[PDB]
């Protein structure tokens, strides 16, 4: 899924990763939280909130 950050977000944990308002993410998985997506950025992969991004699968 083409994930696009609507806002600037700094992770809160080691499992999560940061993005700046406008990053292009790569959603590799989603199979639990209807609040956290496991996407890819900056040579890393982690959890990101669905309310801080505009989804386009």
């Amino acid at each position: 899924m083409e994930a696009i950050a609507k806002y600037d977000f700094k992770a809160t944990a080691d499992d999560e990763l940061s993005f700046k308002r406008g990053d292009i993410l790569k959603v590799l998985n989603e199979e639990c939280d209807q609040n956290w997506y496991k996407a890819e950025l900056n040579g890393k992969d982690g959890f990101i909130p669905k309310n801080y991004i505009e989804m386009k699968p």
């Binding site: 609507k6 806002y7 977000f9 809160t12 609040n35 959890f47 909130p49 309310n51 801080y52």
Partner: peptide, 10 residues
């Protein structure tokens, strides 16, 4: 002012 982030604990 970005949204209130969800509680990341299921």
């Amino acid at each position: 002012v970005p949204p209130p982030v969800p509680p990341r604990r299921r």
